[PDB]
Amino acid sequence: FDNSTYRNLQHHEYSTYTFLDLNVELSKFRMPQPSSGRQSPRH
Amino acid sequence: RFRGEHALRRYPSGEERCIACKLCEAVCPAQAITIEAEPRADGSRRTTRYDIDMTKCIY
Amino acid sequence: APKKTSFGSLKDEDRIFTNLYGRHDWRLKGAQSRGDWYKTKEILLKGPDWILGEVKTSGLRGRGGAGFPTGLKWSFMNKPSDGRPKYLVVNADEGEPGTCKDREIIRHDPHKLVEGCLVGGRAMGARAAYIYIRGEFYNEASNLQVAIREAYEAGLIGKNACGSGYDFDVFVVRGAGAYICGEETALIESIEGKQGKPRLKPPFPADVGVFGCPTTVANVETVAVSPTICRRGGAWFASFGRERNSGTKLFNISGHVNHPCTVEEEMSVPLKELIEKHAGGVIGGWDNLLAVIPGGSSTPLIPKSVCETVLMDFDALVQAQTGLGTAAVIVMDRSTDIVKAIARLIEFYKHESCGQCTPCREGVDWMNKVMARFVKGDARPAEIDSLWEISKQIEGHTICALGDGAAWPVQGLIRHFRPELEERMQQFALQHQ
Amino acid sequence: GAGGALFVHRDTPENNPDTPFDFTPENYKRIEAIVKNYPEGHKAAAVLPVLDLAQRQNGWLPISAMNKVAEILQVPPMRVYEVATFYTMYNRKPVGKYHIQVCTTTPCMLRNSDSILEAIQKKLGIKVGETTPDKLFTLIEVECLGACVNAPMVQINDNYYEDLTPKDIEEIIDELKAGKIPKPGPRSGRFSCEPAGGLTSLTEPPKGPGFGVQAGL
Amino acid sequence: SNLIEVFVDGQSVMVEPGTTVLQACEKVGMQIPRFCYHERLSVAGNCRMCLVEIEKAPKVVAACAMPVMKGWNILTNSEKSKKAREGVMEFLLANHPLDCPICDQGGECDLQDQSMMFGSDRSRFLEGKRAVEDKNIGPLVKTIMTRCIQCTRCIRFASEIAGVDDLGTTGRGNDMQVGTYIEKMFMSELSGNIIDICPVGALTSKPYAFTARPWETRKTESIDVMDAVG
Numbered sequence A: 001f002d003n004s005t006y007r008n009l010q011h012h013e014y015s016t017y018t019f020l021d022l023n024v025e026l027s028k029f030r031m032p033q034p035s036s037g038r039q040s041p042r043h
Numbered sequence B: 001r002f003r004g005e006h007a008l009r010r011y012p013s014g015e016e017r018c019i020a021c022k023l024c025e026a027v028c029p030a031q032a033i034t035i036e037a038e039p040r041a042d043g044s045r046r047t048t049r050y051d052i053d054m055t056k057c058i059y
Numbered sequence C: 001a002p003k004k005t006s007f008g009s010l011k012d013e014d015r016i017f018t019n020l021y022g023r024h025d026w027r028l029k030g031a032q033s034r035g036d037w038y039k040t041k042e043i044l045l046k047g048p049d050w051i052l053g054e055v056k057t058s059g060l061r062g063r064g065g066a067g068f069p070t071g072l073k074w075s076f077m078n079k080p081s082d083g084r085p086k087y088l089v090v091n092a093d094e095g096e097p098g099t100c101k102d103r104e105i106i107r108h109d110p111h112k113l114v115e116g117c118l119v120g121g122r123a124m125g126a127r128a129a130y131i132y133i134r135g136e137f138y139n140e141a142s143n144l145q146v147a148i149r150e151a152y153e154a155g156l157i158g159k160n161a162c163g164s165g166y167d168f169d170v171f172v173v174r175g176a177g178a179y180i181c182g183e184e185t186a187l188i189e190s191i192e193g194k195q196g197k198p199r200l201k202p203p204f205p206a207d208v209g210v211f212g213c214p215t216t217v218a219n220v221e222t223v224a225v226s227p228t229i230c231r232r233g234g235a236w237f238a239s240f241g242r243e244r245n246s247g248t249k250l251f252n253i254s255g256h257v258n259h260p261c262t263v264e265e266e267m268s269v270p271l272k273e274l275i276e277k278h279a280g281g282v283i284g285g286w287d288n289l290l291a292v293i294p295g296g297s298s299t300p301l302i303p304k305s306v307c308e309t310v311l312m313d314f315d316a317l318v319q320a321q322t323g324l325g326t327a328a329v330i331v332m333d334r335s336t337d338i339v340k341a342i343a344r345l346i347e348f349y350k351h352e353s354c355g356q357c358t359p360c361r362e363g364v365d366w367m368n369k370v371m372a373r374f375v376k377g378d379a380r381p382a383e384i385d386s387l388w389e390i391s392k393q394i395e396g397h398t399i400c401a402l403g404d405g406a407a408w409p410v411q412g413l414i415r416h417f418r419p420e421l422e423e424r425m426q427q428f429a430l431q432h433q
Numbered sequence D: 001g002a003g004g005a006l007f008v009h010r011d012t013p014e015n016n017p018d019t020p021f022d023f024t025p026e027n028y029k030r031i032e033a034i035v036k037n038y039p040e041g042h043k044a045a046a047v048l049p050v051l052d053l054a055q056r057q058n059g060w061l062p063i064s065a066m067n068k069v070a071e072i073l074q075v076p077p078m079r080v081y082e083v084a085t086f087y088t089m090y091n092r093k094p095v096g097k098y099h100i101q102v103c104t105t106t107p108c109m110l111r112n113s114d115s116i117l118e119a120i121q122k123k124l125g126i127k128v129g130e131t132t133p134d135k136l137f138t139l140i141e142v143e144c145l146g147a148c149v150n151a152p153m154v155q156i157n158d159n160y161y162e163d164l165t166p167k168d169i170e171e172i173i174d175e176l177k178a179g180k181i182p183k184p185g186p187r188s189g190r191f192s193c194e195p196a197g198g199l200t201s202l203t204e205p206p207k208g209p210g211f212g213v214q215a216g217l
Numbered sequence E: 001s002n003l004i005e006v007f008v009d010g011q012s013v014m015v016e017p018g019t020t021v022l023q024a025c026e027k028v029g030m031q032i033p034r035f036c037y038h039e040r041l042s043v044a045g046n047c048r049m050c051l052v053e054i055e056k057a058p059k060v061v062a063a064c065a066m067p068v069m070k071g072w073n074i075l076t077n078s079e080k081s082k083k084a085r086e087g088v089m090e091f092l093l094a095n096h097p098l099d100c101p102i103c104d105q106g107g108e109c110d111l112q113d114q115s116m117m118f119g120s121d122r123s124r125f126l127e128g129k130r131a132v133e134d135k136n137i138g139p140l141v142k143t144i145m146t147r148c149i150q151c152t153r154c155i156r157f158a159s160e161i162a163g164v165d166d167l168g169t170t171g172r173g174n175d176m177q178v179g180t181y182i183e184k185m186f187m188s189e190l191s192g193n194i195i196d197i198c199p200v201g202a203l204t205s206k207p208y209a210f211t212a213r214p215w216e217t218r219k220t221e222s223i224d225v226m227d228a229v230g
């Protein structure tokens, strides 16, 4: 147990694509999306 | 304040002041003013006809 | 002894956000070591009605600033299915100047937010949670994504989340620099790929929300405390603060204080005790205090004579004509140009107005020009009253509450510091003949 | 003061529909993953990330990038133009390599943000709306960035630099232009939102799992 | 029946559910002031000119988008409604250009008429006005966007009636402008109707420009022969 150290140091090595790379990685875990019945409101 | 013979005026540059709003034509109690307008060659809003019947005008 | 009369000294065991300062591992293992994701399967198996009742008896009110009772708002979505999917939208825009609590929650205790999303979605019957985070919080958003990835890997969220047979997804959506997107309907429009312009109510999001489906919009702080309220009891939550002002609150003390900081405190703590104990006091001593904006820029300011005994809850601050808001205390000492500070706030609102409706789009820019002239003293005293009326024409007549929140600081400045305005006006008058 | 920038587009050799822009194949995979997040039949909801993705690939948003996003997501280009012009995080004009944003709202104004702004101006020799001739620094003012507790602060390309002094920001600038990248966070020996000295709360070790769980659960 | 009872100034009216306050008011001959509401367009609710007081309710409601509730008493002429109308008209006229003599909307302006019937008679605006550059959308529709009040009627008409999504708003706040953001012609076989729906002189007819005033014209009701639609 200690309190002199800072543990949130991972964000020091994030690139510009970290968020979208994480989204791509998470794409495999999601449930199928619901469908409105059309391709677009303009269809 | 004396009211006598009508005249159309200009800006100091020599451009006519009238912009053909037709407010004078609408307010004239004697219907003595007749106005026709159109866009000028430069796009300015200017009259093509401005007539005052001085025998209808009540001054 | 029951019916406490003094509030404002709670020990570490009753603090919900135990990793507020990022001194412990924000990851999954560290969060589990702190009691996160504990008996979540049992809480889900209790049922939406049990969770809604536990939220109701906790006395929790909306931590976004309006202070709406959370139980009724979340039970508005307890309707049966009508063919449309049900969604939870977590507001993480964090646009109020002076407010930094949601950023700290997201970057330091993200699993609390994820578990709160799961529990609230189960209570409302939501299929998935959309977390709308500020676009400037890129590191916070990526930390939240890492936490969500760990929860998915763990089996905590997603298909058969925990082991209750309930499927729940958590998505993260980033905005692009718009404070108006903190408004719930403007946020919903922003998710749908439009301009961040608020909708009119009715319909409420509980009927027509995101993608035209039933939706509930909740603050990150409100969502985060939900699992702790469910576990520790809810009646434990109501034991803090006054009646209808229950629980614990995160305060952001900024401005003219020795130690500006984000702290957690009992709800009904007096403002002076909060400033002295945690923030280190006003710069130059308490006698140097001039004004305090108690709940972010949208709340009217109060002078030193009111800050002596005022309580830091919704009802007490309403009685002081300022409201609690986001519990962001901006402190200004006697060495500040208070007119300039209020003008800066008005300029912020001018730059953040979405321009959809006439009263905000026009009157806020008008008040901005008027306050710019006031700062230099380039007006006459009668205009002060004029300014007041201008604000009264904006308040209550706009679509969203941004017009109200732009009018309120002007009203507070006129109410408490009119002689300063008149003195500046006369100084400019005889200085320029 | 005022906006300064214009909300109409005029064609230009460096910004016109024929300006070459296209997404990299990995960016196409990212776009596919982004689009998968939203319900089927609602694809406009992906204009905000995808457009931002373009700005991450290109550095700014030309008219061709907006047209490409509209064509990909099958939305009218006018809607993409509305989104691009509504939100201030989108750059419809090229910016420098390091885009410096200084918060000047009242909480940061109280903690001497003008000193930081003038230190940056005199270090770089440019105004509040200009870019350096070498195209490495663009400085602007912004509204509250959400770190008022750590005022004064600036943002440089998705990084927060808080608790600033003129010497600190000058050091950050001269380290940034040397090819390095400074570590984000406060520059006051605080590295969090804690009180400047003392840590008045949360001193005790956190309680274990199930510490306060109610009976019957 | 399915009708519900509402009250307009204390007079009982029977209306179908989903009827708005504006339609209930017009069921007794009362026309609520409006700028952005058109009965053939989708509801906008942005102009805020239609704000009306409901009895026992502290907040005024937008009559163009608010469905009437059972037992509501609409007060179309109370002090609160009049003050709301005056404030909204003051905001509308704060940045409007002093263009009435050179504006083709002169005697036909909804802004002018509703200022004369519902607004104040003076101005306490002591600042400088805003100015907007003009946009060219073709030879049929003349555009002077300083007179725009941002009711977004043209945008909704183009998007819904005409099926053309070329019009929109760029920017935000006071500096929010209606246009195409690019030099683009608004060609549609129904493109001229945006001239009629625009309450102000922001959109006018180019062939008709400067030639006549509405009070001079004599109106003859006739039938179009350019197609078989009649």
Ligand SMILES: NC(=O)C1=CN([C@@H]2O[C@H](COP(=O)(O)OP(=O)(O)OC[C@H]3O[C@@H](n4cnc5c(N)ncnc54)[C@H](O)[C@@H]3O)[C@@H](O)[C@H]2O)C=CC1
Pocket: C062, C063, C064, C065, C066, C068, C073, C076, C093, C094, C095, C096, C099, C182, C184, C204, C205, C217, C298, C324, C325, C326, C400, C401, C405
């Ligand atoms: N945390 C931040 O960054 C900011 C916070 N704020 C705060 O936001 C407050 C005002 O926000 P509003 O949403 O306009 O307040 P509000 O009173 O209109 O409603 C707040 C919540 O209660 C719900 N609600 C209210 N009435 C309802 C009804 N009759 N039926 C169903 N649901 C209902 C709404 O859906 C909404 O979610 C302000 O007091 C301000 O303090 C403002 C700006 C920024």
Ligand SMILES: Cc1cc2nc3c(=O)[nH]c(=O)nc-3n(C[C@H](O)[C@H](O)[C@H](O)COP(=O)(O)O)c2cc1C
Pocket: C061, C062, C063, C064, C065, C066, C067, C068, C091, C092, C093, C094, C095, C096, C179, C180, C181, C182, C183, C184, C217, C218, C219, C220, C222, C400, C401, C402
């Ligand atoms: C102009 C404006 C900006 C707002 N910005 C925010 C924000 O950044 N974050 C937020 O949680 N709420 C914001 N709100 C209020 C939200 O509606 C609130 O968060 C939402 O009602 C959730 O409230 P709850 O915490 O009671 O569920 C804003 C409201 C207005 C009028």
Ligand code: SF4
Pocket: B017, B018, B019, B020, B021, B022, B023, B024, B025, B035, E101
């Ligand atoms: S038409 Fe008559 S009122 Fe109008 S500008 Fe010309 S002279 Fe004056």
Ligand code: SF4
Pocket: C180, C197, C198, C352, C353, C354, C355, C356, C357, C358, C360, C361, C398, C399, C400, C401, C402, C403
């Ligand atoms: S009050 Fe301002 S921000 Fe809110 S909808 Fe109206 S114009 Fe937009």
Ligand code: SF4
Pocket: E096, E097, E098, E099, E100, E101, E103, E104, E105, E106, E107, E109, E110, E111, E112, E147, E199, E200, E201, E202
């Ligand atoms: S649109 Fe109407 S109010 Fe505006 S200048 Fe023209 S006539 Fe006057």
Ligand code: SF4
Pocket: E147, E148, E149, E150, E151, E152, E153, E154, E155, E178, E197, E198, E199, E200, E202, E203
């Ligand atoms: S151009 Fe006319 S119709 Fe279109 S938004 Fe402006 S005032 Fe309304």
Ligand code: FES
Pocket: C097, C098, C099, D103, D104, D105, D106, D107, D108, D109, D143, D144, D145, D146, D147, D148, D151
């Ligand atoms: S006031 Fe500067 S970050 Fe909020």
Ligand code: FES
Pocket: E033, E034, E035, E036, E037, E044, E045, E046, E047, E048, E049, E050, E051, E062, E063, E064, E065
């Ligand atoms: S007519 Fe109702 S807001 Fe415009």
Ligand SMILES: [Mg+2]
Pocket: E105, E194, E195, E196, E197, E198, E199, E200, E201, E202, E203, E204
């Ligand atoms: Mg028109």
